[PDB]
């Protein structure tokens, strides 16, 4: 790397080289500044209202709470030791605070300990195929922790049974041999085994960035620089390029364009429309 001549010697693997024109490397302008852009949403995100819910939904009629217009701090969730598991599928659990999402759904319910494994993509079982089925391409994080002194006493948690044939993903069927009401209650008691203890499960279903996102992580925005090489990060769409004013007319629901190569071609500044 000392000089252009020394580059030619290294490529040619010789201390002397024949006359000619020799390709050696690739010149690249380096980015000078770093730009981070995110929206005003700095209102905090009510994850406490989910994970600290005094009452959780039964598994057959699981409670689907929407999360939007907030700044989600996932480090609080990820680091807390109160969780017996934290299993993400589409993303790495430490990267959550860097991304920004179109919307978030917190599907919360209580299931028996033995079936905690059934809350997973491409699984089947009594709970997974009659109560709460996840799609195979599920994107999100599954969280569970013991509730043996928040739920057990108790027979108020129901789960379906013999008569049915369907579970198609995220369907909530709350409809109520000789006869049998298609629901039987768990016998959650404080004196039973771990496999028989009740488990409070919260599943954060993420919808990947396809629209102007609304739930961003706790990132600090900066100013915007035009006509210069910068490393840019818009709502988690990272890359390197020269940001210029455009003459494109985005539709009000389109966050970003693309090229034929699936590379980003144009973006909408989340703070300046």
């Amino acid at each position, epitope marked *: 790397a000392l000089d252009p001549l020394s580059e030619t010697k290294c490529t040619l693997k010789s201390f002397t080289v024949e006359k000619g024109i020799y390709q050696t490397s690739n010149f690249r302008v380096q980015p000078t500044e770093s730009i981070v852009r995110f929206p005003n949403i700095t209102n905090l995100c009510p994850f406490g209202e989910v994970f600290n*819910a*005094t*009452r959780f939904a039964s598994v057959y009629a699981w409670n689907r709470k929407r999360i939007s217009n907030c700044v989600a701090d996932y480090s609080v969730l990820y680091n807390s030791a*109160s969780f017996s598991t934290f299993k993400c599928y589409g993303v790495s659990p430490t990267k959550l605070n860097d991304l920004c999402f179109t919307n978030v759904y917190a599907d919360s319910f209580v299931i028996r300990g033995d079936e905690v494994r059934q809350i997973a993509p491409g699984q089947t079982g009594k709970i997974a195929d009659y109560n709460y089925k996840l799609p195979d391409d599920f994107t999100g994080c599954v969280i569970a922790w*013991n509730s*043996n*002194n*928040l739920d057990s*006493k*108790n027979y108020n948690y129901l789960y379906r049974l013999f008569r049915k044939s369907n579970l198609k993903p995220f369907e909530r069927d709350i409809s109520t041999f000789n006869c049998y009401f298609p629901l039987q209650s768990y016998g959650f008691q*404080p*004196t039973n085994g771990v496999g028989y203890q009740p488990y409070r499960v919260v599943v954060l279903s993420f919808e990947l960035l396809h629209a102007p996102a609304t739930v961003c992580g706790p990132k600090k925005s900066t100013n915007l620089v035009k006509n210069k090489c910068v490393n840019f990060n818009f709502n988690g769409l990272t890359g390197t390029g020269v940001l210029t004013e455009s003459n494109k007319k985005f539709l009000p629901f389109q966050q970003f364009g693309r090229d034929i190569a699936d590379t980003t071609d144009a973006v909408r500044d989340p703070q300046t429309l």
Partner: antibody
Amino acid sequence: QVQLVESGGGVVQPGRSLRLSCAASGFTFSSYAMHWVRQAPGKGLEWVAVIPFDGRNKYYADSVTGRFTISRDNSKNTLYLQMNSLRAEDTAVYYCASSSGYLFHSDYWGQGTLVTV
Amino acid sequence: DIQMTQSPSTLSASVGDRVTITCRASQSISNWLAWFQQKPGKAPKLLIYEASSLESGVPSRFSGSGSGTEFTLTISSLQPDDFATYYCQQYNSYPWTFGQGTKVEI
């Protein structure tokens, strides 16, 4: 049968501390969540604190957050509530309460002990 | 939090009378409410749980009704030992809150 006995009540100067002790008998204390509750003299009673049997979680009323701590030891079948930075408005009779299930049941309420600040 | 309003605050009746106590919830407790009675020098003493279910040792004249936000405590016929204050209590979400109370007078 089932009885909860409170002890440790008395008179405290403002800004000082007091510890309450609570004995349980007649039920499986080691698997029951515990509650503390106080009533001001001829005023409405106020929920104070709760701890599950294994104590991984610990909830408080707002007015006592950061100053009160609840503790238990199933070995001694005893419930405790340590008060610090006591104020005059904390003067109340403090009760122990629990549940065979999920609710304070009248069978599971102590006689109460008075704390005067 | 969850706020709960009792009505009436005070109410005077004679022995044998029909009385109703109304409890007002700021939002759904869907059917998770409790009724308590206290005489002076007495602890809060249970009547009902989930607002319609009878505790052991509780006279059948005591009963409750209601779901969601509007709830009711019932006395069919007054007995002389029912002269006391009555508290509806929610437990849907912590902290557990209590109504202002309703003391029945002679």
